[PDB]
Structure 1
Amino acid sequence: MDKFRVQGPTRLQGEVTISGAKNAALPILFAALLAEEPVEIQNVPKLKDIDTTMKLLTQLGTKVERXGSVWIDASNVNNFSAPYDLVKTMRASIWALGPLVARFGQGQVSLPGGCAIGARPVDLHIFGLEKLGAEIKLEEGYVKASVNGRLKGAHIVMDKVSVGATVTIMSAATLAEGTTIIENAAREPEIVDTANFLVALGAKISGQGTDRITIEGVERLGGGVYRVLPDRIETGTFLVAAAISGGKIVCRNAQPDTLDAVLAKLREAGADIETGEDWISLDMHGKRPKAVTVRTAPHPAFPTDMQAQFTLLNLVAEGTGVITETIFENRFMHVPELIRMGAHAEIESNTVICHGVEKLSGAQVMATDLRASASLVLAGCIAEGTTVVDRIYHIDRGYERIEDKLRALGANIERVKGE
């Protein structure tokens, strides 16, 4: 089992090229199940989650190839289930459900079990499907959906803002008979990306990116070529890496408009930020960051996927920073890990109260969250001495070669395989 050996402190300086969004590539890959003709998805990151998704697709009888692009041919889907072993390593597996039932009239996906960051049921996905006319049963731990003929469009109001349920419903609706309206839809840039992918295939969708999505179902979806938007979380993570190290960086292949909240908070922390059409520059001018107050919420508010990263920022900032989590109430495992490194903070309910320190100290820490745990690697970059991050497979699931990108920024980091 891999581990990172990080030697700090290091001032991060240089350039990084942002990879395609893991969170757009995922739902788009699942949506490709709908395509009758070959599809080429461009700008797909090379990460563990994509590997798992590829595996799942192949298990359905989908032909899959990859490099920068992932080539999909779902003309011969011959299997309709996502097994326990796979779903257990990737909750996003639930996304296979909707396309399968919508196109083939059947689909079975192992029901996701417990999650360390909090309660993450998929009740809304199921509800949505049912609303579309799907019959759903639970057998041997498998959620089994079925419909005789086409799904039927319906007016659905979401009890919660859900990225996942919005994708499930929107995707399945493209093949339903009639019009589907998703009210209180998630507005994430990844939702707009997936919708656009769908439309490129022949789907009829409007309102994507707003709280109200309207889908007019069609008979079949063709094929095509589609480029995945830049990864906003990867971008934010690198921006924070520079901001907490007194550094200077330029992010290439970026989409500034997906980052307003994060950029604004970085400015509050004291960063000098410039943006262009496809780039973002950040210069700390060698300054320590200033503590900020953050509240995670659905896009375009501050994203929960940047929360750990900002907690780190606050932990080495001047002042008392406060971070409140409204999406994943228990998403605080990074905190005690950071405290092992000398940080100071208290967790009261869904809020962490940070007491910024001048310097962190290297220590042994454990990764557990595919997006948040990158925080540990960042901490090692600025801590005094050696930090060893265990279980880095978690990071591998959500980031493409993060050590390589960090290394090009000046980081002293080594992938240690010897156990």
Structure 2
Amino acid sequence: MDKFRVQGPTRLQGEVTISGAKNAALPILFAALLAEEPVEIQNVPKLKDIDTTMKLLTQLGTKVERXGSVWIDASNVNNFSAPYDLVKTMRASIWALGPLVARFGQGQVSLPGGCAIGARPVDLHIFGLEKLGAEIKLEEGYVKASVNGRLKGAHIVMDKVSVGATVTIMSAATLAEGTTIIENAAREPEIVDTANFLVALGAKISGQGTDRITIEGVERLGGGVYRVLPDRIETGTFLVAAAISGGKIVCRNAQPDTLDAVLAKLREAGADIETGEDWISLDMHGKRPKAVTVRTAPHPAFPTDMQAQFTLLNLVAEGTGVITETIFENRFMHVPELIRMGAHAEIESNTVICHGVEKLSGAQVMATDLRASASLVLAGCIAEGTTVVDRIYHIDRGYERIEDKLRALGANIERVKGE
């Protein structure tokens, strides 16, 4: 089992080129199940989640090739199920459900089980599909959807703001008879990206990026070429890496407008930030960060995917920082790991109260979250001594060659193979 050996402290300096969004590439890859013609998805990151998605697609009879792009040919889909073993390694597998029933009249996906970060049911996905006319049953742990003929457009109001259910409903709606309105839709940049992808295929969608999405169903979707937007979380993670190390970095292939909350919080922490059309620069001028207060919430508020990273920032900042999580209530596993490295903090309900320290110390820590756990690697970069991060497969699922990118910034990091 892979592990990272990080030697600190290091001041991160240099350039990093941002990869395509894991979170846009995923739903777009699933939506390609709707395409009758070949599709080329550009700017797809090289990471474990993409591997699992490619595997799932192949299991359905989809022809898949990849490099920077992923080429998809779904003209011969011949299988309609996502098995337990696959869903267990990637909850997003649920996204195969909607496209399958919308195009083929049937789809089966293993029902996701428990997860360490909190309760993550998929009730809204199921509810949405039902509203569209699909019949759904649970058999042997498999959510089985079906419809005789086309789905039917419906006016659906969402009980929660949900990135995943908004994608499920939006995607399936593109082939339904009539008009579908998704009220209280998630507004994430990835939702806009997926909608734009659909439209490039011939779908009729408007309102993407707002709380109300309208879809007018069409008979078929064709093919085309589409470039995935930049990864906002990868960008935020690198920006934080510089901000906590007294460093200076420039992020290339970036999309500043997807990061307003994070940028503003970085400025509050004392960062000198400049932005261009496709770039973001950050200079700490060798200063320790100032503690900030953060509240996660749906886009365009501060994202839960940046939460652990900012918790780290607060932990080495001057002052008492407070972080409140409103999306994933139990997403605090990183805290006790950081405390093993010398940090000080208390968790009260969904809020962590941080007491910044001057320096962290190297220690053995454990990764458990595909986005949050990158925080441990960052911590290792600025801590005194050697930090060993176990179970880095988690990080591999969410970041493209993070050690390579960090190394190019001056980090002392080694991938240690257990085999």
TM range (shorter): over 0.9
Secondary structure in 1 matching 2:119: coil
- Partners of 1:48 and 1:236 in 2: how far apart? 20
Q: Cα deviations across residues 276-300 of structure 1 (Å, max 9, x unaligned)?
A: 0000000000000000000000000
SS at match of 2:353: strand
Listed one character per residue, the Cα deviations across residues 150-198 of structure 1 (whole Å, up to 9, x for unaligned) are 0000000000000000000000000000000000000000000000000
Deviations 1:183-233 (A, max 9, x none): 000000000000000000000000000000000000000000000000000
**Counterparts of 1:386 and 1:16, CA distance in 2:** 24
Taking the TM superposition and a 5 Å limit, the aligned residue runs for 1:377-396 are: 377-396=377-396
- Any idea what the Cα deviations from partners look like across 1:301-353, whole Å, max 9, x if unmatched? 00000000000000000000000000000000000000000000000000000
Partner of 2:168 in structure 1?
A: 168
**Alpha-carbon distance in 1 for matches of 2:258, 2:179:** 29
Q: Partners of 1:117 and 1:24 in 2: how far apart?
A: 21
Whole-Å separation in 2 of the counterparts to 1:264 and 1:3: 33
Q: Secondary structure at the match of 1:409?
A: coil
Shift of 1:82: 0.1
Within the alignment, does 1:350 sit opposite 2:357 as a pair?
Answer: no
Corresponding residue for 1:371? 371
TM-score by length of 1: 1.00
Counterparts of 2:168 and 2:223, CA distance in 1: 19
CA distance in 2, matches of 1:179, 1:405: 45
The correspondence of residues 296-375 of structure 1 with structure 2, limited to 5 A, is: 296-375=296-375
CA distance in 2, matches of 1:289, 1:319: 9
SS in 2 for 1:168: helix
- Hey, what's the Cα distance between the residues in 2 that align with 1:180 and 1:115? 31
Report the secondary structure of 1:322's partner residue. Answer: strand
Distance 1:362 1:77 in 2: 50
Tell me the alpha carbon deviations over residues 15-57 of structure 1, each in whole angstroms, 9 at most, x when there is no partner. 0000000000000000000000000000000000000000000
> Which whole-Å deviations, capped at 9, do the CAs of 1:44-81 have from their partners, x for residues lacking one?
00000000000000000000000000000000000000
Instruction: State the distance in 2 between where 1:9 and 1:370 align.
Output: 24
The equivalences for 1:37-48 within 5 A come to 37-48=37-48
Whole-angstrom distance in 1 between the partners of 2:132 and 2:94: 17
2:269 matched to which residue of 1?
269
What is the rounded CA distance, in whole Å, between the counterparts of 1:269 and 1:150 in structure 2?
52
How many percent identity over aligned positions? 100
User: How many aligned positions are there?
Assistant: 419
RMSD in angstroms over aligned alpha carbons? 0.3
Alpha-carbon distance in structure 2 between the residues aligned to 1:203 and 1:357: 53
**CA–CA separation in structure 2 for the residues paired with 1:359 and 1:65:** 46
| Equivalent position SS for 2:170 | helix
Tell me, what secondary structure is at the counterpart of 2:403?
Answer: helix
Give 1:157's aligned residue.
157
Cα distance in structure 2, aligned partners of 1:85 and 1:44:
24
SS of residue matched to 1:280: strand
Instruction: Tell me, in whole angstroms, the C-alpha distance in 2 between the residues paired with 1:242 and 1:404.
Output: 15
2:213 match: secondary structure: strand
Per the alignment, in what secondary structure is the counterpart of residue 330 of structure 1? Answer: coil
Q: 1:66-99 CA deviation, whole Å, 9 max, x = no partner?
A: 0000000000000000000000000000000000
1:362 to partner: Cα distance? 0.1
How many angstroms does 1:418 deviate by? 3.2
2:7 aligned counterpart, secondary structure:
strand
Q: Aligned equivalents of 1:186 and 1:39: distance in 2?
A: 26
Q: CA deviation at 1:360?
A: 0.1
Q: Give the structure 1 partner of residue 278 of structure 2.
A: 278
Q: CA separation in 2, counterparts of 1:356 and 1:183?
A: 41
Structure 2: 5+ residue stretches without partners: none
Three-state SS of the structure 2 residue aligned to 1:273 is strand
Task: Give the structure 1 partner of residue 90 of structure 2.
Answer: 90
What is the alpha-carbon distance in structure 1 between the residues aligned to residue 29 and residue 288 of structure 2? 41
Which whole-Å CA distance do the structure 2 matches of 1:247 and 1:205 have between them?
43
What's the counterpart of residue 179 of structure 1?
A: 179
Distance in 1 between residues matched to 2:410 and 2:205, nearest whole Å:
45
The equivalent of 2:258 in structure 1 is 258
Name the SS of the counterpart of 2:205 in structure 1.
strand
Offset at 1:138? Answer: 0.1
Determine if the alignment matches structure 1 residue 121 to structure 2 residue 121.
yes
Deviations 1:109-163, CA, capped at 9 Å, x for gaps: 0000000000000000000000000000000000000000000000000000000
Q: How far did residue 406 of structure 1 move? A: 0.1
TM-aligned CA deviation for residue 5 of structure 1: 0.1
Q: What does the per-residue CA deviation read over 1:218-250, in whole Å, with 9 as the maximum and x for residues that have no partner?
A: 000000000000000000000000000000000
Instruction: State the alpha-carbon separation in 2 of the partners of residues 24 and 374 from structure 1.
Output: 19
Question: Secondary structure at the residue paired with 2:202?
Answer: coil
Runs of 4+ aligned residues of structure 1 deviating over 6 Å after TM superposition are none
